[PDB]
């Protein structure tokens, strides 16, 4: 059965870019998906996306604009001490000057760069680059 | 020898060793 929704989603996105596709249909929608795409689109990795109101759970149509190599989930959502944030970004990102490990803190879902500044930490949701 | 018949061999062997032990109750 469905066990992540957010992993199901980022997958379809990856398989879309890979196969040269320019759009995706993401079912179902969810808050965690939404704020994730925000962190993605705000950094220029996707285009516009658009929720669809079925009286159920949602759908999204995202616009891929190339330049996306891999957006991924990390499962389970591991607990990350603030000093271990580094050892993740070291592990699952290409170089020290781009790409993002987007987390989830009690100060809201955000990328590791930002959360570094706000001096917050928490659980790790996934990665983008 | 063929795996099947080596099985048969060790089967025989077992029963025989079982006997030998029983020789002392």
């Amino acid at each position: 059965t469905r066990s992540s929704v957010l992993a199901d989603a980022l997958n379809a996105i990856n398989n879309a870019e890979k196969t040269g596709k320019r759009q995706v249909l993401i079912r179902p929608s969810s808050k965690v998906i939404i704020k994730f795409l925000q962190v993605m689109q705000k950094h220029g990795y996707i285009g516009e996306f658009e929720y669809i109101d079925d009286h159920r759970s949602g759908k999204i149509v995202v616009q891929l604009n190339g330049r996306l190599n891999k957006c991924g989930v990390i499962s389970p959502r591991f607990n990350v001490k603030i000093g271990d944030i580094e050892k993740w970004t070291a592990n699952l990102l290409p170089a020290r000057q781009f790409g993002y490990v987007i987390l989830t803190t009690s100060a809201g879902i955000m990328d590791h760069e930002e959360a570094r500044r706000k001096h917050v930490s928490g659980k790790i949701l996934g990665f983008v680059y | 020898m063929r795996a099947k018949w080596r099985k048969k061999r060790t089967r025989r062997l077992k029963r025989k060793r079982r006997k030998v032990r029983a020789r002392s109750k």
Binding site: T19, G20, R22, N65, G66, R67 | -
Partner: protein, 87 residues
């Protein structure tokens, strides 16, 4: 790719496909650069002055090479009523 005092280091800035914006690699020999001419006042095509698209080896092998151009053409105002966004 900059550096310290803003200088442009690194060998060469690669082309980028016009259908996927994916880099066209140095050895991508299924990559294709179609050159399309511009017509002036009635017929008489202009030499030297092109409309150029860039297709990557991957889009072409997949057979989308055609349909990509149609969408890419109309967009740049080169065709009409051929390609249709809704399918």
């Amino acid at each position: 790719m900059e550096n310290d005092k803003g200088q442009l280091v690194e060998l060469y800035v690669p082309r980028k496909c016009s259908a996927t914006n994916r880099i066209i690699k140095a050895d991508d020999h299924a990559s294709v650069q179609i050159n399309v001419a511009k017509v002036d006042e009635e017929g008489r095509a202009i030499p030297g002055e092109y409309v150029t698209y860039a297709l990557s080896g991957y889009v072409r092998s997949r057979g989308e090479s055609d349909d990509s151009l149609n969408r890419l053409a109309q967009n740049d105002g080169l065709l009409k009523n051929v390609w249709s966004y809704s399918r």
